[PDB]
Scaffold this motif. Structure first.
Motif, short mmCIF file in Angstrom:
data_model
loop_
_atom_site.label_atom_id
_atom_site.label_comp_id
_atom_site.label_asym_id
_atom_site.label_seq_id
_atom_site.Cartn_x
_atom_site.Cartn_y
_atom_site.Cartn_z
N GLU A 6 17.92 -9.43 62.26
CA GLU A 6 17.13 -8.27 61.89
C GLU A 6 16.73 -8.26 60.42
OE1 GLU A 6 18.81 -4.51 62.94
OE2 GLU A 6 19.28 -5.04 65.03
N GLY B 289 13.37 -10.97 45.86
CA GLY B 289 12.51 -10.14 46.66
C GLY B 289 11.88 -10.98 47.74
N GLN C 201 12.11 -13.40 51.44
CA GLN C 201 12.76 -13.39 52.74
C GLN C 201 13.53 -14.68 53.02
OE1 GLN C 201 13.15 -10.95 54.78
NE2 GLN C 201 14.01 -12.06 56.53
N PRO D 214 11.35 -6.63 56.12
CA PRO D 214 11.94 -7.86 56.67
C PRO D 214 11.42 -8.18 58.06
CG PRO D 214 13.62 -6.51 55.61
CD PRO D 214 12.37 -5.70 55.59
N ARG D 215 11.05 -9.46 58.24
CA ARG D 215 10.39 -10.02 59.42
C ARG D 215 10.86 -9.39 60.72
NH1 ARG D 215 7.68 -15.65 58.71
NH2 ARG D 215 7.65 -16.63 60.80
N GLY D 216 12.16 -9.16 60.85
CA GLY D 216 12.70 -8.73 62.12
C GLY D 216 13.44 -7.42 62.04
N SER D 217 13.10 -6.63 61.03
CA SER D 217 13.62 -5.27 60.93
C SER D 217 12.77 -4.32 61.76
CB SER D 217 13.67 -4.83 59.47
OG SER D 217 12.37 -4.52 59.00
N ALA D 218 13.22 -3.06 61.82
CA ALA D 218 12.56 -2.04 62.62
C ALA D 218 11.26 -1.55 61.98
CB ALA D 218 13.50 -0.86 62.86
N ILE D 219 11.19 -1.58 60.65
CA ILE D 219 9.99 -1.13 59.95
C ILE D 219 8.86 -2.16 60.01
CG2 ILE D 219 10.85 -1.99 57.76
CD1 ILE D 219 9.51 0.40 56.40
N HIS E 233 18.79 -3.25 52.34
CA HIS E 233 17.35 -3.05 52.24
C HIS E 233 16.98 -1.58 52.43
CE1 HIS E 233 13.58 -2.44 54.61
NE2 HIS E 233 13.07 -2.99 53.52
N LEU E 234 17.78 -0.83 53.18
CA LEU E 234 17.49 0.59 53.28
C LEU E 234 17.66 1.27 51.93
CD1 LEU E 234 16.89 3.24 54.65
CD2 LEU E 234 19.16 3.20 55.72
N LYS F 14 6.37 0.47 61.08
CA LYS F 14 6.87 1.55 61.92
C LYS F 14 7.61 2.55 61.05
CE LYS F 14 8.31 4.07 65.41
NZ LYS F 14 7.35 4.72 66.33
N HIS F 15 7.21 3.80 61.15
CA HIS F 15 7.85 4.87 60.42
C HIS F 15 8.31 5.91 61.44
CE1 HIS F 15 6.92 3.24 56.48
NE2 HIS F 15 5.64 3.16 56.79
N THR G 222 14.37 5.22 61.06
CA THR G 222 13.85 3.93 61.47
C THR G 222 14.87 2.81 61.27
OG1 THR G 222 11.71 4.75 60.75
CG2 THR G 222 11.92 2.41 61.33
N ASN H 59 10.62 -9.77 51.05
CA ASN H 59 11.60 -9.06 51.85
C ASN H 59 11.36 -7.55 51.91
OD1 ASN H 59 12.81 -7.78 49.50
ND2 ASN H 59 14.17 -9.56 49.22
N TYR H 60 10.19 -7.05 51.46
CA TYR H 60 9.96 -5.61 51.45
C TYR H 60 10.05 -5.01 52.85
CZ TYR H 60 7.17 -7.73 47.54
OH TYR H 60 6.72 -8.52 46.49
N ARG I 74 19.83 -11.15 52.81
CA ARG I 74 19.29 -10.57 51.59
C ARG I 74 20.17 -10.94 50.39
NH1 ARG I 74 16.06 -6.48 51.28
NH2 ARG I 74 15.42 -5.75 49.18
N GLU J 234 20.57 -1.34 60.04
CA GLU J 234 21.10 -2.23 59.02
C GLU J 234 22.53 -1.87 58.65
OE1 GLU J 234 19.98 -4.17 54.63
OE2 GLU J 234 18.86 -2.42 55.39
#
Ligand SMILES: [Cl-]
Ligand SMILES: [Cl-]
Ligand SMILES: [Fe+3]
Ligand SMILES: [Fe+3]
Ligand SMILES: [Fe+3]
Ligand SMILES: [Fe+3]
Ligand SMILES: [Zn+2]
Ligand SMILES: [Zn+2]
Lengths: 354, 346, 346, 354
Positions: free
Chosen positions: C40, C48, C50, A47-52, A205-206, A318-319, B255, A44-45, C44, B259
């Motif tokens: 998104e 760690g 997904q 996440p599949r569908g996050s912005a990063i 996660h943020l 993406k940063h 970014t 989950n570092y 969680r 969330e």
């Protein structure tokens, strides 16, 4: 002979599924995979569908994911012709497998996958060695196993360990890295066998992502205090995707309290300021505001070394800033040369080919 | 009898004084019920140890505290931060015992030191892990003009932005009280987010980490939205490292801000009127001009001075600053910023 | 429409049914705000990972659940224990997300399975770590005759007797609701009290441990004094080991009872009307007569039957018991004890 | 030749103060002690002034403490002439020293103290070897060091470790124990580097004490599942002061799930029922209600072995039942002989002297 190459020190392969390891495992583990209906240890570092997770511009595969094939990574990373070599890190969480001999076995299958399906495909790729952190003598054996293949260029470790990397328990990894002339890299992510902060589980996660800089302070303090850098003096440590602006305040307190407690660690004779500047390197992506005007020249002032920063694009993450906006933070061409080619030459000795 | 509101003029704030308490001190404020209980079991906490912690290193003593600190350096407000008698009190596993001890601590520090000398005033320990008690002791004493803050610890079982602690925050600032969180061991988790440190360099420098994690949680919890009134401070935690932390938070937020779609403001904007920081121990960069730079990169308006008397790493109230430190800002952390935080009138 | 109170006659209780929920099921009860949030970031939790957890192994499906369980073995009360759709819901680190999901779970299991077939009824997941939400959803739905218990987990951040959870207990039994705690991963601590297990034998057998620790805490917390009304149960936790646990507690209490001078009763006496236990998976001693012996050494009046449909280690409603198991007691756990626990009228 | 002796398998020495180690440390560590104003690592397992700490009848020293000198222990333990030998366990928490090389050094000083000031004083005493659990290769070195002195008769370990004792990390201890023909004992107490339950910190010491039986289940499951008993087949494990009635329910589930998951641990060919009955022994003090009428005969039924129980008085702790009330639980003289002399002969081979 040679001129140091532009090396991207942190790019990522994303295992399509736990099924992509099936060709590389023993009959015993393979059957286990298809029989467990294949739990995916995808982390989950990012996440599949996050912005990063991935760029808008990024070449994607059948299911819309980036970086699942070398053909897609190579096409993006080497498009504009500026990068000479990229260092592949595959973060699939074999490290979070609790069954020790499964962690062992998937780690090797993972590395076989990188070799046969990425390194075999582009002479421009290099990789780190995924290792079973759960069992350090086996992690050392994994390091010895790939020491032959000099396309593998560092040892990968997660930012959050089970015990700090300086503990005796973890010495085989440093010994093995030393023996093989390989740097050890700490890349953000963790085994999560305890809360990721000293004060519990971060909700978002943020929060986790930003806060993971705290654990790296702990690891460097551990690694140096316990004396890794005197037992294994050829050690090089690359901090991948973990920021770097937190270092100078950290190093100044370390030095201050080193001076206070010198007889407690009497093997540490040079200052941790000098030690960290010689032994620790760090990638630039994310730049964490160092890309903003003047900030990059200033951070090298507070770090007190121009040898530490090594260039990375963190593809495909993406940063806020992109791989080359690091230039908007310095008026020093000589410093950009050190970041893009010269400092990474300390890690890998990669010269420009023809 | 009755006290004046804290008055700051002419003179400097010390946000961290550790009073030197004697044995026969808290028993007049301790029910027998707990006295024999301590006789039988002592103050059990998150260790497997009977006396020590994880990492182990006028009259009564008013005079030594007035003479060589409150007079030596002209200190006019010193904030009293008693951990516990002779290992912090609120971290005792028996939470009913813990409450009684802060009850006793609060009574004693009031009856014995701040009233005999109103130059000092007190931050009241509360049981930050049983909020019912925290609110109960806030209402008990936090109305006193002898209480200037609520006192918590850097290490907690959940991050400080969690909602377990929100009952304490309303209570606290529904009494117009700010909260200080002082460097701490215990809490319930390891020294770091990735294991127990071994040598004293890791232990002492590790203290910074827990503050980083607490800051992030307090901000991205939305806590300073639901409590726009709340003012909290980090004590004995080293100010300088906070600025790249805050900086990295914003850069990741840009970014990943989706969330947390409720966080009204941009994370670093919450610092303005919510996050202060004690200066002890002073950061010593190799080039001494980086200090002022880093201090205002965090926030020049939210840094308060501290000695940590009588601890070994105390800072002389002006041998602490480097060669050409900005005088305007030195003055703002000695007098102005502390004044702002504790809520004294200009 | 409207339901009758649960009616038990003639027929057997199953205190653990795991309904088989389809993908497009909880979205009609999920605000868009959370739907795109799950898109998104997913749910969680304390991993760690997904998708997976730490240790990874009428109509819609009513018919398969009525035919081969509710009819095959004459089951007349089956208690619905939905972990979450496709990793338990209440353990999600975003506690606001967690609440919405149990909200959705509760709505769905009511609207879709218990009303279409009142033989089943439901234990409502709540966020046992944000008690404000737990009390809020208890009041929301726990009034329904379609709710028969509150549903929690075996693993929690603090022991279940802690006072963080006391707001949930009043709410729960101020609605005449008992609480079941079902075998669980996560929680915030390691698998054991001394580290993370490696092989599946340790993982699966380790589940017993967390129940031992929860029982001790619930009793010696004084929880069943402050809540003399409260009835709690341990599910998928193995009944037999509880009896030597309870036995050792008493024997230590006799010496050390002075640490807890408020515990009205002698610890094992709290079992009478507060601690029940599901039978699945059935304990198999080498000599099969030890089972009945151990069952009534715990308490013969507080053991309820369960299948754990559709899990691999399900127990046939009477191939589960050994050769000469006492018929009186078999009958009491099939019918009488469950009746007693869920509060149906004789 | 010989008849097995009556051996008390768990009695305790209480270090008077951290100053009693000053004679046994290097100049470097010694100065450190007097310079740190001597933090005492006295544990909280049996709180100084709780009811379990010591007997009313117990001979006490200058400050009213029992078991701080051998003269006081020997005078009480051997008064009625029934005990032949006692096994000394000193629980002073060197294991909770975080500084690794201090843990190492105090552990050895502790063992020097036991040898010179207890074992040298009474041929009737034996001891376990305190070892620095933090650093298992050093713990193994501590075991090798005292392997010569055959007055040291087992290896001491705390019930709550940092990682489970079956993890590879901890193998040196079992290897060293095997090499030295020594049993490993797990005695209640812990290093407390995590919450002592899977669900957090227990509030009361009564809760902690009772509940510590949960961790022993975890350790045996670990030790056996990871394969300690096949790598080191001479291994003997004595469970000291941890109860024993929790074992049969535990073993039955282990056996049940072993049968379910046999291919996951394919090195475990015999049943953990058979394995536990052969390799694990346990002391009788506390008896936890097994002293009550009939209960002791019954627990040996549920354990399915009469070889497991070994006698102890747990001197000087106070328990609800006394050392010999274990007799009120069986009508079997043959079983009492096994408990008092024959089962401990498997651990130590101590015959009756003259
Ligand atoms: Cl001045
Ligand atoms: Cl029937
Ligand atoms: Fe302080
Ligand atoms: Fe201090
Ligand atoms: Fe179940
Ligand atoms: Fe199940
Ligand atoms: Zn990266
Ligand atoms: Zn003992």
């Amino acid at each position: 002979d040679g001129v140091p190459a532009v090396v991207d020190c942190d790019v990522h392969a994303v295992l399509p599924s736990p099924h992509s390891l099936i060709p590389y495992l023993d009959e015993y583990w393979a059957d286990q995979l298809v029989a467990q209906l294949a739990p995916t240890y995808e982390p989950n570092y990012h996440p599949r569908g996050s912005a990063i997770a991935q760029h808008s511009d990024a070449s994607v595969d059948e299911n819309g994911r980036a970086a699942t094939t070398a053909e897609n990574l190579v096409k993006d990373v080497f498009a504009d012709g500026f990068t000479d070599f990229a260092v592949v890190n595959c973060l699939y969480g074999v490290q979070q497998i609790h069954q020790p001999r499964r962690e062992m076995a998937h780690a090797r299958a993972l590395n076989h996958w990188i070799a046969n399906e990425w390194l075999d495909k582009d002479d421009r790729l290099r990789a780190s060695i995924v290792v079973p952190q759960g069992s350090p003598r086996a992690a050392a054996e994994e390091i010895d196993f790939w020491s032959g293949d000099k396309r593998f260029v560092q040892v990968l470790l997660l930012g959050q360990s089970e015990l700090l990397y300086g503990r005796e328990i973890n010495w085989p990894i440093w010994e093995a890295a030393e023996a093989a002339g390989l740097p050890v890299t700490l890349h953000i992510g963790g085994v999560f066998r305890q809360a990721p902060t000293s004060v519990g589980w971060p909700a978002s996660h943020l929060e986790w992502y930003v806060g993971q800089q705290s654990n790296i302070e702990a690891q460097l303090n551990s690694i140096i205090s316990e004396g890794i850098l005197q037992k294994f003096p050829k050690t090089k440590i690359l901090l991948s995707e973990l920021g770097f602006n937190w270092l100078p305040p950290f190093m100044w307190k370390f030095d201050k309290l080193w001076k206070s407690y010198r007889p407690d660690i009497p093997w540490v004779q040079e200052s941790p300021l000098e030690l960290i500047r010689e032994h620790v390197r760090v990638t630039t992506s994310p730049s964490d505001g160092a890309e903003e005007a003047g900030r990059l020249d200033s951070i090298v002032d507070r770090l007190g070394s121009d040898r530490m920063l090594v260039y990375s694009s963190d593809y495909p993450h993406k940063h806020h800033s992109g791989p080359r906006d690091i230039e908007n933070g310095t008026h020093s061409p000589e410093l950009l040369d050190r970041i893009y080619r010269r400092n990474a030459f300390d890690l890998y000795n990669l010269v420009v080919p023809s | 009898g009755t006290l004046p509101a804290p008055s700051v003029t002419t003179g400097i704030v010390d946000a961290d004084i550790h009073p030197v308490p004697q044995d026969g001190a808290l028993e007049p404020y301790l029910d027998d019920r707990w006295k024999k209980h301590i006789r039988e079991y002592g103050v059990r906490t998150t260790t497997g140890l009977q006396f020590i912690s994880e990492y182990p290193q006028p009259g009564s003593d008013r005079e030594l505290l007035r003479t060589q600190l409150l007079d030596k350096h002209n200190i006019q407000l010193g904030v009293l931060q008693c951990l516990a008698p002779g290992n912090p009190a609120g971290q005792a596993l028996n939470q009913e015992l813990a409450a009684a001890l802060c009850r006793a601590t609060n009574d004693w520090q009031l009856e014995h030191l701040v009233y005999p000398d109103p130059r000092m005033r007190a931050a009241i320990p509360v049981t930050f892990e049983t909020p019912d008690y925290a609110v109960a002791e806030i209402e008990r004493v936090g109305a006193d003009p002898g209480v200037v803050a609520v006192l918590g610890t850097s290490k907690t079982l959940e991050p400080l932005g969690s909602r377990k602690y929100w009952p304490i925050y309303e209570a606290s600032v529904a009494q117009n009280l700010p909260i200080q969180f002082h460097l701490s061991q215990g809490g319930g988790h390891a020294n770091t987010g990735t294991g127990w440190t071994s040598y004293h360099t890791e232990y002492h420098t590790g203290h910074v980490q827990s503050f980083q994690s607490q800051l992030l949680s307090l901000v991205l919890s939305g806590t300073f939205d639901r409590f726009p009134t709340l003012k909290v401070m980090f004590v004995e935690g080293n100010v300088a490292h906070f600025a790249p932390l805050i900086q990295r938070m914003d850069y990741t937020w840009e970014t990943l801000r989706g969330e947390l779609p409720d966080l009204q403001r941009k994370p670093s904007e919450y610092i303005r009127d919510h996050i202060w920081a004690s200066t002890q121990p002073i950061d010593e960069p190799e080039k001494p001009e980086h200090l002022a730079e880093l201090l205002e990169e965090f926030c020049g308006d939210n840094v308060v001075f501290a000695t940590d008397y009588p601890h070994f790493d105390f800072d002389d109230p002006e041998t602490a600053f480097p060669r050409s430190f900005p005088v305007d800002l030195r003055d703002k952390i000695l007098r102005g910023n502390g004044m702002r935080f504790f809520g004294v009138t200009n």
